[PDB]
Design a protein around this ligand. Structure first.
Ligand SMILES: Cc1ccc2c(c1)[C@H](CC(C)C)NC(=O)[C@H](CC(C)C)NP(=O)([O-])CCO2
Ligand SMILES: [Ca+2]
Ligand SMILES: [Ca+2]
Ligand SMILES: [Ca+2]
Ligand SMILES: [Ca+2]
Ligand SMILES: [Zn+2]
Length: 316
């Protein structure tokens, strides 16, 4: 759409009010021209055909409940774009300011979100297992990060590489949640998962085993489900990243924390400079070590913590 940039206001899934960037041209659309080639949010109107229709509103106020998921998808995508640009100097997912598109209200009672190779898609949840998925900033950031990974390392979606791909999305979605200082934690999806139950989440990076995911290489899943357990084994890497950041003793191995910022610098460099489509856990370790070496010196504490963390999860 061609029109005038403006700002509207609405309420998100969690009932919070926020301003969002809109474009005016007869209607007000969810099209943000202030970021790269734009952020665009579409209505899939409970169907599965994508992308659906660019979101149009008559008055620039988005307080209807059908509006909520769009508000959040639109706003959280803008925050995530900002994180990459401000923190890593990366312009959108392809590094060349590609337009970011999302569709909401996908299907009926769909309990998931995903990147389909060209855009993000969010289900509204069935209202018991989930509420509209775009209400979780860690969820939106996990989706957009899959785009980042596809454009860079290109980790294939299966076995070890696929688990690395999933951990990357969890890690950066968690860093984005902290960046936005939105009640940050090391849990994934807490904000949209099981509305009736407090305190739970889909996955835990601080203690993956809490939900049954592995937290040590000896406990990895070797079967065929989930493409070889990409959503299961990511637990081992998630645990490693949590230790590098926060520190701790795991399975008797002690790691001194180096903090989030460095965790993000080291993983972003590994991802964009050393990882390849078929990289395995052991290769991820070499990459993280080399990245930290590059950034901080081979005899740095940083390098030391990266090594300890992987040793603690059993990855040699
Ligand atoms: C077993 C499995 C297959 C495909 C999936 C997912 C799991 C998993 C289902 C969630 C846990 C309900 N999806 C994800 O972890 C993320 C969404 C969460 C961050 C809320 N979606 P993607 O990994 O991008 C797509 C595949 O989802
Ligand atoms: Ca309106
Ligand atoms: Ca949180
Ligand atoms: Ca979280
Ligand atoms: Ca819950
Ligand atoms: Zn994922």
């Amino acid at each position: 759409i061609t029109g005038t940039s403006t700002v509207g206001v609405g309420r998100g899934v969690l009932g919070d009010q926020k301003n969002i960037n809109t474009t005016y041209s007869t209607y007000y659309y969810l099209q943000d021209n202030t970021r790269g080639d734009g952020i665009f949010t579409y209505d899939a109107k409970y169907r599965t055909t994508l992308p659906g229709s660019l979101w149009a509103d008559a008055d620039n106020q988005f307080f209807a409940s059908y509006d909520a998921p769009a508000v959040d998808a639109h706003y959280y995508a803008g925050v995530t774009y900002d994180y990459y640009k401000n923190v890593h100097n990366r312009l959108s997912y392809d590094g060349n300011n590609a337009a970011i598109r999302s569709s909401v209200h996908y299907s009926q009672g769909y309990n998931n979100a995903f990147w389909n190779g060209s855009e993000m898609v969010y289900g509204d949840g069935d209202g018991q297992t989930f509420i509209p998925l775009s209400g979780g900033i860690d969820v939106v950031a996990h989706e957009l990060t899959h785009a980042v990974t596809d454009y860079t390392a290109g980790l294939i979606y299966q076995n070890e590489s696929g688990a690395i791909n999933e951990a990357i999305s969890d890690i950066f979605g968690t860093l984005v949640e902290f960046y936005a200082n939105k009640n940050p934690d090391w849990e994934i999806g807490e904000d949209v998962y099981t509305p009736g139950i407090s305190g739970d989440s889909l996955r835990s990076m601080s203690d993956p085993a809490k939900y049954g995911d592995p937290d040590h290489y000896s406990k990895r899943y070797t079967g065929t489900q989930d493409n070889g357990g990409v959503h299961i084994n990511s637990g081992i890497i998630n645990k490693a990243a949590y230790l590098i950041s926060q520190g701790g003793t795991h399975y008797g191995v002690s790691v001194v924390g180096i903090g989030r910022d460095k965790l993000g610098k080291i993983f972003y460099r590994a991802l964009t400079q050393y990882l390849t489509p078929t990289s395995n856990f052991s290769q991820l370790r070499a990459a993280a070590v080399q990245s930290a070496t590059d950034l901080y010196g081979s005899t740095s504490q940083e390098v030391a913590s990266v090594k300890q963390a992987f040793d603690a999860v059993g990855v040699k």
